[PDB]
Structure formats: structure tokens, C-alpha cells
């Protein structure tokens, strides 16, 4: 349940970045940009965290 909840939160964040990039690209109306992107599409236990992890003391 909670894992799907975290998955949905991550999905919201990723959709935010994707839609930002989508609007930025949709503003661009130059034909050279669209031609180049068309050519491109057609081409294709841990030490640390807890306490002092070192040689002298742990």
C-alpha cells in the first residue's frame, strides 16, 4: 500500500518534469528543430549514515 503511495508520488514528480519539458518544446516552432528531432527519432549495512565510519573508531 505505502509502496504504491510512494510510487504515485514519484510519478507525480516525474510527470511534472516531463510536462515542463513538453511545454518548453511545444513553444518552439522553428522547422529546423522539428526536422532534427524527426531525424533523431527515425535514427533510433552501510557505514556512513549511522555514525562515524572510520578506521580508528566506528
Amino acid at each position: 500500500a505505502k509502496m504504491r503511495r510512494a510510487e504515485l508520488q514519484r510519478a507525480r514528480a516525474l510527470q511534472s518534469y516531463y510536462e515542463a519539458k513538453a511545454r518548453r518544446e511545444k513553444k518552439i516552432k522553428s522547422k529546423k528543430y522539428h526536422k532534427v528531432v524527426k531525424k533523431g527519432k527515425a535514427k533510433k549495512t552501510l557505514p556512513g549514515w549511522g555514525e562515524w565510519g572510520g578506521v580508528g573508531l566506528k
Binding site: 522553428s30 522547422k31 529546423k32 526536422k35 532534427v36 531525424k39
Partner: peptide, 19 residues
């Protein structure tokens, strides 16, 4: 020679009396 897509070329802005 014909320049390629990588070559930077900007689209031009179009702006008597009868008696």
C-alpha cells in the same frame, strides 16, 4: 556545396479640367 542541417541559417523576417 549545400550546407547541412547543422549549419546555422536563420529564417528571414518578412515585413486638367475638361475646359
Amino acid at each position: 556545396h549545400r550546407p547541412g542541417p547543422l549549419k546555422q541559417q536563420n529564417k528571414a523576417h518578412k515585413g486638367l479640367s475638361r475646359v
